Amino acid sequence: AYTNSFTRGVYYPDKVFRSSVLHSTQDLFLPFFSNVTWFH
Amino acid sequence: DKLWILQKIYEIMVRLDEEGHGEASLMVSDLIYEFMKRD
Amino acid sequence: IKVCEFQFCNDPFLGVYYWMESEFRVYSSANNCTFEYVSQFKNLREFVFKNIDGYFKIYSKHTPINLVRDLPQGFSALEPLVDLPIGINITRFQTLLALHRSGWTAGAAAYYVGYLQPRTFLLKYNENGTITDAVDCALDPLSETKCTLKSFTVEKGIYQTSNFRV
Amino acid sequence: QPTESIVRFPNINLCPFDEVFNATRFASVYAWNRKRISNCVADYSVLYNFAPFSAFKCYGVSPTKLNDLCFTNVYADSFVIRGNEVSQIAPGQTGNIADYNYKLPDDFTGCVIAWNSNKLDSKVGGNYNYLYRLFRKSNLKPFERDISTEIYQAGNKPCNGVAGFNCYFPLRSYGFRPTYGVGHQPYRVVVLSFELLHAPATVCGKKSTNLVKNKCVNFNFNGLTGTGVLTESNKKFLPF
Ligand SMILES: *[C@@H]1O[C@H](CO)[C@@H](O)[C@H](O)[C@H]1NC(C)=O
Numbered sequence: 040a041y042t043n044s045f046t047r048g049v050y051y052p053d054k055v056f057r058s059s060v061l062h063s064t065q066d067l068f069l070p071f072f073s074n075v076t077w078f079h
Numbered sequence: 080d081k082l083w084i085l086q087k088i089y090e091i092m093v094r095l096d097e098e099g100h101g102e103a104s105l106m107v108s109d110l111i112y113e114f115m116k117r118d
Numbered sequence: 119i120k121v122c123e124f125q126f127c128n129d130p131f132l133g134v135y136y137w138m139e140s141e142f143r144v145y146s147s148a149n150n151c152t153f154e155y156v157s158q159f160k161n162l163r164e165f166v167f168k169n170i171d172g173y174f175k176i177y178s179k180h181t182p183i184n185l186v187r188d189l190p191q192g193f194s195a196l197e198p199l200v201d202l203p204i205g206i207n208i209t210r211f212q213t214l215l216a217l218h219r220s221g222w223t224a225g226a227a228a229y230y231v232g233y234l235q236p237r238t239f240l241l242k243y244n245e246n247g248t249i250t251d252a253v254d255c256a257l258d259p260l261s262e263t264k265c266t267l268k269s270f271t272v273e274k275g276i277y278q279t280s281n282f283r284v
Numbered sequence: 285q286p287t288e289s290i291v292r293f294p295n296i297n298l299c300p301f302d303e304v305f306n307a308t309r310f311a312s313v314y315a316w317n318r319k320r321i322s323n324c325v326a327d328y329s330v331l332y333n334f335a336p337f338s339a340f341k342c343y344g345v346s347p348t349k350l351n352d353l354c355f356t357n358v359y360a361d362s363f364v365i366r367g368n369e370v371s372q373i374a375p376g377q378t379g380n381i382a383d384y385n386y387k388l389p390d391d392f393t394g395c396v397i398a399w400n401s402n403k404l405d406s407k408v409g410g411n412y413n414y415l416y417r418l419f420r421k422s423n424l425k426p427f428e429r430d431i432s433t434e435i436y437q438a439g440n441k442p443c444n445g446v447a448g449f450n451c452y453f454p455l456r457s458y459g460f461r462p463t464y465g466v467g468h469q470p471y472r473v474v475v476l477s478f479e480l481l482h483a484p485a486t487v488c489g490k491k492s493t494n495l496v497k498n499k500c501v502n503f504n505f506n507g508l509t510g511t512g513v514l515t516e517s518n519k520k521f522l523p524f
Pocket of ligand 1 (some may be wrong): 244246
């Protein structure tokens with residue numbers, strides 16, 4: 040069926056190092072709390 | 080004509096090689112190339 | 119990892135016999151082989167596969183988990199594990215499972231697939247540079263406010279985030 | 285102003301040129317060998333410093349420029365011909381080799397490299413393993429390979445697959461012997477083709493400069509060009 044993504048699916052957008060800062064990036068990300076298809 | 084002599088030059092290329100004149104054979108090889116290129 | 123011409127089997131897999139992998143029912147063709155790479159539940163393995171500008175990238179993360187089923191609720195940054203210059207169209211994919219030979223019965227496991235979408239994310243990089251939290255700018259109006267303020271905490275008040283149009 | 289420029293590039297894998305240039309047996313020119321080179325780093329000065337090369341000419345590139353460039357693929361074509369024929373391996377050439385065996389395009393991008401292989405490829409009594417094509421109806425196109433073995437028809441009568449009057453087997457052996465003059469001795473040839481498509485360039489020559497610290501310099505780190513002073517840091521960068 041399907042499951043909730045929650046906050047998973049976040050990856051570093053690039054090889055850039057940022058410390059103690061909030062960065063806004065537009066990229067191919069998994070939407071939060073989206074339906075993820077699960078298989079067993 | 081052109082064909083008689085072509086055959087004769089081919090034959091001498093081959094006979095040159097068979098009698099151990101490899102280098103000379105190669106030089107006739109080159110003549111065959113140039114001669115067949117002409118009109 | 120091989121970027122090469124393969125004719126996949128109808129049900130490709132690796133068959134394990136009691137445990138050692140004894141069968142390789144994956145492909146019948148290994149031709150025009152452009153690229154070959156040999157590289158190095160209590161375990162959660164997360165992989166992001168993105169094929170962009172001809173480069174295919176795998177982002178991998180390991181998480182110690184104790185949930186019986188489904189995605190545990192948590193935050194984990196997905197470090198880029200491998201990036202390769204592939205340059206071929208990728209429209210479909212298929213995971214290969216280790217279907218043990220009993221007639222094939224597989225051991226208990228779960229795999230989850232999610233399709234990435236173009237989204238704006240506000241990532242909180244800590245002192246180490248690790249992403250410790252993220253905000254999906256389109257998830258909800260509170261998240262839109264957090265993205266607009268460029269802050270994970272918004273002060274009391276009214277904020278203009280976007281424009282509604284029909 | 286920056287005192288001096290420093291360029292930093294990863295340590296610098298390897299391309300298997302040794303296997304091309306130091307192969308035991310080479311191909312006959314009519315059936316020339318092609319090796320695709322990709323996904324690797326090449327030191328081309330290892331090439332241009334190997335001392336016994338009788339020919340070494342590049343056409344749309346330069347040897348020292350090579351060790352700084354990246355390409356999508358490099359193709360290494362290789363064969364044996366006579367010394368006097370080496371000059372036909374060049375754009376715009378005609379002759380028995382260029383016409384009927386191995387043909388470069390007018391717009392060639394790469395290097396032609398040759399050396400004398402008399403010690404390896406000549407035999408007392410003649411080495412008949414190396415062949416060329418003497419007869420063909422028309423010229424090869426660039427990078428065409430013709431390995432057919434059909435009786436060539438020089439005259440008016442069809443050959444019907446039998447050699448005879450004006451019906452010639454189309455290939456000859458060189459029969460290289462060590463007593464031949466140098467023009468007739470065997471030369472090994474490597475043609476390098478440098479291909480740049482709209483794609484990642486994964487066959488890479490560049491340069492590495494000594495690092496300088498606490499000095500105003502113009503630095504180039506893997507394509508990141510900037511100016512400043514480089515000092516020790518306490519930031520724990522993640523490995524990626
Ligand atoms: C990395 O994280 C650890 C947490 O144990 C912390 O003690 C350390 O100061 C951090 N290092 C940097 C450079 O931010």
